[PDB]
TrEMBL record, chain A:
One of its GO terms (biological process) is cysteine biosynthetic process from serine. This is Cysteine synthase 3. Its EC number is 2.5.1.47. Residues 16-306 form the Tryptophan synthase beta chain-like PALP domain. The modification N6-(pyridoxal phosphate)lysine (covalent) is found at residue 56.
From TrEMBL, chain B:
This is Cysteine synthase 3. Residues 16-306 form the Tryptophan synthase beta chain-like PALP domain. One of its GO terms (molecular function) is cysteine synthase activity. Pfam families: PALP. The modification N6-(pyridoxal phosphate)lysine (covalent) is found at residue 56. The modification N6-(pyridoxal phosphate)lysine is found at residue 56. It comes from the Eukaryota. Signal peptide: none annotated. GO terms for biological process: cysteine biosynthetic process from serine. Belongs to the cysteine synthase/cystathionine beta-synthase family. Transmembrane segments: none annotated. The gene is CS 3. Its EC number is 2.5.1.47.
Length: 336, 335
């Protein structure tokens, strides 16, 4: 039989109380490959189940919550961040409920759908010149911080320890859901809050947990390669972030942009999970991990940071693989 | 003292096992209005928490699951439905996991984003003549069924009792989450599976539960008025569906399209919940319900069928309200 969800047995006081507690789900369709032994377990953690459908719900919430508790954010002050992605959404959701203005700096032509989401939450969008790109946004952000040194609270997504600290919950959920069986955690790296936060908190409970960081093959800066252009949205920031701690990470797996996209298409077609681009990268790294002989029988947990619906404006679902499942998985997983 | 979500303490065997069990959340921002007594409770059920983010996850799942168990859908057969919205998504998600082909008939006039999600799930899109609109989709749909009778299982979203039956779970979740305190259930009506299924199953546990159906003021056919154009996507089918049972419904509340959109904008700004268009209609009807003097102190539960992110290509978030919360709520709630 098939048992769907049970009642949560709770009345949440506001939308922030629904953040986290996301499902951990078995992969089956894309694990059906000779390279992966049948007793190896590959589980995906679906951060799309957050109310605004990405892992950054946790990050925006905890950055703002902790700042309020610490007195670093006080009435009269406003939040600011330079972001065109999910961090802006997570900050805008938390800011709307806590009652603080949120200023988001981004180029005028960047992620117009995310602009609309953030504006709907009441954000004040600071749109730098589209012709100037993200350097124009960074320039406008720095100018604003200098013009408002006491009024603005900077989220500092790439360095804020309250980003990393949000993942005490992520890690505990993995620990509880797997009954302590988790062996490997795979996380594609943007701010590095997830890989470091989950990795540190799992390793406190179980020292032998292997931490796998994933980055674009085209911008593999954690591997010491130069920054370069890539198309795995949400990761590959092009620099080693202040949160990143190399000693927490056991392996860096680069994933090609095109393989991340192809993996994402295969996951929705063969497992029915519509995950985002970085999720495709993470899943492919995890499936390669599941093919290594020393990993037979292990429990491999893969973070899926957001949903594919956020990428319908790209060609992620316009491109079509002509081949069968086995042709697609062979093209991705065969070492030859 | 904010308590965020706790672990599910479960390993789900597949994505279908994550369907349902959606959160019930207090409204506070849009309920801060003199017309609503402070002891009345207005709760929203967030069907956007389903894996493909709408109530139709439950419907597509149960229609296919029950047909497999009953042997009405047999290996070799294929699923078919005529739909451009959430019903197709829910069917495609369940079909992909159960391993059955899913055929969605719709005009080629629909935008790629609608077809994009469904084809990502491996669905076979049978695109009818773009000029002949929705009638052409039904024509092609009836021709396929008539020419291959034993091949297709029809989902029949507007008449299928396995639609309605999915909401035994929805109702039980409301019953348990409120510990039986639910007094009024508010549901905007598309297929009517939700209002009838939740209404029937709550009334079996608590006869006094009031059932409020919501429809667009511009196409208020449940009240006997003519079909007409409206913009509350997901509801206002323009006919009285086979599932609809007038005896289950205690009140029909019409909501103007523009008021539904304005309500949806207010909910995301003041409660931080980015609900869809039909959710704006349902919440506005619920807030009016919350203003009635005989409803003081009651627990009012409102179904929110999907999220606003699914409507970024529409004009939902085009208009901006310049006024304050009180100005916006006054414009929607005062007479
Ligand atoms: C982050 O916002 C994000 C990531 C990376 O997570 P970390 O910042 O490294 O914790 C990956 N993918 C998406 C879509 C994100 O939004
Ligand atoms: C249905 O798919 C739907 C409704 C109405 O639900 P019922 O079909 O009446 O149970 C309302 N809003 C949206 C977005 C829907 O998809």
């Amino acid at each position: 039989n098939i048992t769907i969800n049970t009642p949560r047995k709770r009345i949440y006081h506001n939308i922030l109380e629904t953040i986290g507690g996301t499902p951990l789900v078995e992969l089956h369709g894309v694990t059906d490959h000779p390279s992966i032994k049948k007793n190896t377990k590959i589980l995906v953690k679906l951060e799309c189940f957050n109310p605004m459908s990405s892992v950054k719900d946790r990050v925006g919430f905890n950055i703002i919550y902790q700042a309020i508790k610490d007195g670093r954010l006080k009435p009269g002050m406003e939040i600011i961040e330079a972001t065109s992605g999910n961090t802006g959404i997570g900050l805008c959701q938390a800011g709307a409920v806590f009652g603080y203005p949120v200023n988001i700096v981004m180029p005028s032509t960047m992620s117009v759908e995310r602009q609309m989401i953030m504006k709907a939450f009441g954000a004040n969008l600071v749109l730098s010149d589209g012709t100037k790109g993200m350097p124009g946004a960074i320039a406008k952000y720095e100018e604003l911080i200098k013009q408002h040194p006491n009024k603005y609270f900077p989220a500092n997504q790439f360095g804020n320890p309250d980003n990393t600290a949000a993942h005490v919950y992520t890690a505990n959920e993995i620990w509880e859901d797997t009954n302590g069986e988790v062996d490997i955690i795979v996380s594609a790296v943007g701010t590095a809050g997830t890989v470091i936060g989950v990795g540190e908190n799992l390793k406190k409970k179980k020292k032998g947990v292997k931490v796998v960081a994933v980055e674009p093959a085209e911008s593999a800066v954690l591997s010491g390669k130069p920054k370069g252009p890539h198309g795995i949205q949400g990761i590959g920031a092009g620099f080693v972030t202040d949160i990143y701690k190399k000693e927490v990470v056991d392996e860096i797996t680069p994933i090609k942009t095109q393989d991340a996209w192809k993996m994402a298409r295969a996951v929705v077609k063969y497992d029915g999970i519509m995950c985002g681009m970085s999720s495709g990268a993470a899943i492919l790294a995890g499936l390669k991990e599941a093919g290594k002989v020393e990993n037979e029988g292990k429990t491999i947990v893969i973070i899926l940071p957001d949903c594919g619906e956020r990428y319908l404006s790209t060609d992620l679902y316009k491109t079509i693989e002509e081949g069968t499942k086995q042709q697609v998985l062979d093209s991705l997983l065969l070492h030859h």
